[PDB]
Amino acid sequence: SDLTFCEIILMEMESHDAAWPFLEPVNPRLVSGYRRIIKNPMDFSTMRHRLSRGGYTSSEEFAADALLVFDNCQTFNEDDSEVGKAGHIMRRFFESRWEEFY
Ligand X SMILES: CCc1c(-c2csc(N3CCNC[C@@H]3C(=O)NCCC(F)(F)F)n2)[nH]c(C)c1C(C)=O
For ligand X, the closer of residues 67 and 83 by Cβ is: 83
SS (H, E, C) 34-57: HHHHCCCCCCHHHHHHHHHCCCCC
For ligand X, the closer of residues 42 and 59 by Cβ is: 42
Closest-CA residue to 91 (of 59, 58, 69, 64): 69
> Taking CB under 6 A as the rule, does residue 70 contact ligand X?
no
> Taking CB under 6 A as the rule, does residue 67 contact ligand X?
no
Write down the least CB distance from residue 4 to ligand X, Å: 27
Which residue's C-beta sits nearest to ligand X? 21
Binding mask 6-45 for ligand X (x = CB under 6 A): ---------------xx---x---xx--x-----------
Contact positions vs ligand X (CB under 6 A): 21-22, 26, 30-31, 34, 73, 76-77, 83
